[PDB]
């Protein structure tokens, strides 16, 4: 019941603020290291084995992607992963690999002009190891996963290059569908009212809404919205109502109640 | 002035085979890709630096890499520069390598600081990346080559900072979100470098480009009799001179300082005042619209009676060495420290860099040993400290020195080669040696032991530039004229 | 400047719906965006204003008549995209003057013929 919000700034480094459950005030619980964290790009947080770990990537190539404990640690406390290369985006997911019978955690590290990297949360090493590459193409911007009928489907998204929704199969993924990119710096899947949707932005078109076809197993064009410079989509469900926030880098953030 | 004049940096790009294979083995794609990157960097530089980067030529290796390719940016940069010295001969202000081998360092591209307009230093290496990414890397590397670097002392003191506080500036580590504005200290370093005489080869307009004849591109190229640019900006400069890449009835120019109001200016006008004593004033030829070619004092000419020497148009003194290495407030110490520390001492006075057994310096000359300055600050403007800054204390002087390094193997902590020790006595290999060690050439002279028949100064091209009313090549005949 | 009927922004000419060719484009914009165009005639050289422009989209239109050498004056244009524009026929001499063009798209335009 103690929120540790990661407030990251492109200048002056980043901090971790603690929200007291009583005073509702955000006190800096941990001034995170700024020697490597200068221009943060994306942070991914997750809990596994009762250990809270969050991934930090720097928009600059000097700051290397690293995983840190909830309390906060140093440069390469438990693992180093991707370094001396591009660090752009990271996404945490759970997929069943061929060797391991049960569900296996992973990270996907997408980088500019660099092949995306799969990272298995190997329990033997207890680390996000096994730096590999997807067989699809180069220079993928963003990644996010979801589960349709147990089968994992994930997005490999490029700003202009045709993005992909692709199915997991145990060792690598298997292609499912490809959709055009018309200014989609982000393409986020969502599940609202048990309905699997996905939103692709459009810096140069009208943002597109896909619904997972229950018959064709492909994301058909469901709807077309217009939002100023979409960058992320985030959904809430309170009581019997659902709402969705569409970020805006160059304007006002859009809000849509799912009805 | 010279700063306000439009600089033209003749850049040539060397491309390895890694990105050639990554670009599906396509020559034309790589050519247009380099053209786009050059245009993007020129758009970056036009806003403030007023410098156009002309892509004079470009070479891409469709076969394979000629020399050894390593992930070390320094070793790869050295290999590229030595390959340029061995094979590349065409005139180009900068020679930049697009490194397909993505460097395993934290810095984007490796370029020498202030190394432009040099045969063994004029350029750098930029690693593989996105179009915008390597465009930014090339901009940073070319800023490095022109002496524009992020000021560490001012960063620590907060004297000047990035005005694009949103995503930082270009000079720092290349974030994903590129900025659009350079700091004012970048421009200040540019004026300091140009006034020092460095970057003197950036003031020539190439007649041949990789771009086909395009009307209004800002350069008078082949097939274009005149070029004032796009008529949108042609109103301010060269309105009546050239129109639509064509002359306006009776005309003789399109742009240029040597041609005021679209007409030839009187003979003897100075189209470029000398930045310092190392520079020679340039006078228009009387029939050329563009200013005279940049000419500086030949390498070895002293900035003053004895002290200081002009190398490549840049003045070099012990005080200037301390200013470049440590800071403006830092000045060279007196001969007291030179004779009391370089004679004997560890980390305080040393001729050669030998940690185990320091090289002894003789009492005949001590001005090429450990570089000793006065009031050295906490950190130098550029470089790194090999350990700690050396401090040593009837007159009392605050005596100091250091081991400032660079991206090259050369150590800036010692006295740079060519710093005067006396009459024709200058540093070579951390020792005072005569001119015969450097084997400086003799300009066109007729008398004995004189330069250009005594009266007159030889330019950097080993050609005499005689004084006023001296038309002879070797300054021997007087031709009055009005 | 930035047309009111268009949804043009600071960094783009994001035209939602234009009655015809907008010749009021400033050189400030770096890209173009046309969707659901009402006029049926692709005009000729309507962007003789900024060769530095790079991008434009044509989505779900009916350009049954298209100018030869269409939209001339953009040698640096490289993002040429037409999608869903149901077009009866294309003028033969339409793709000229584009010497630095990299990406093309002719999607859902329902063409049955293409000239030599």
Numbering used by the authors:
A (entry chain D): 293 to 551
B (entry chain C): 233 to 625, 630 to 718
C (entry chain B): 41 to 156
From the article:
Meanwhile, the S473L mutation of LGI1 causes epileptiform seizures due to reduced binding to ADAM22, which is a member of the A disintegrin and metalloproteinase (ADAM) family and acts as a receptor for LGI1 in neurons without protease activity.
In this study, the 3D structure of the 3:3 LGI1–ADAM22ECD complex was determined at a nominal resolution of 3.79 Å by cryo-EM single-particle analysis. LGI1EPTP interacts with the metalloprotease-like domain of ADAM22 to form the LGI1EPTP–ADAM22ECD complex, while the LRR domain of one LGI1 molecule interacts with the EPTP domain of the neighboring LGI1, thereby bridging three distant ADAM22 molecules in the 3:3 complex. Like the crystal structure of the 2:2 LGI1–ADAM22ECD complex, the LRR and EPTP domains of LGI1 are linked by a two-residue linker (Ile222–Ile223) in an extended conformation. We then analyzed the interdomain motion of the three LGI1 domains (assigned to chains B, D, and F in the deposited PDB file) in the 3:3 LGI1–ADAM22ECD complex by the DynDom server (Veevers and Hayward, 2019). On the other hand, the density of the disintegrin, cysteine-rich, and EGF-like domains after Pro445 of ADAM22 is relatively weak in all three molecules.
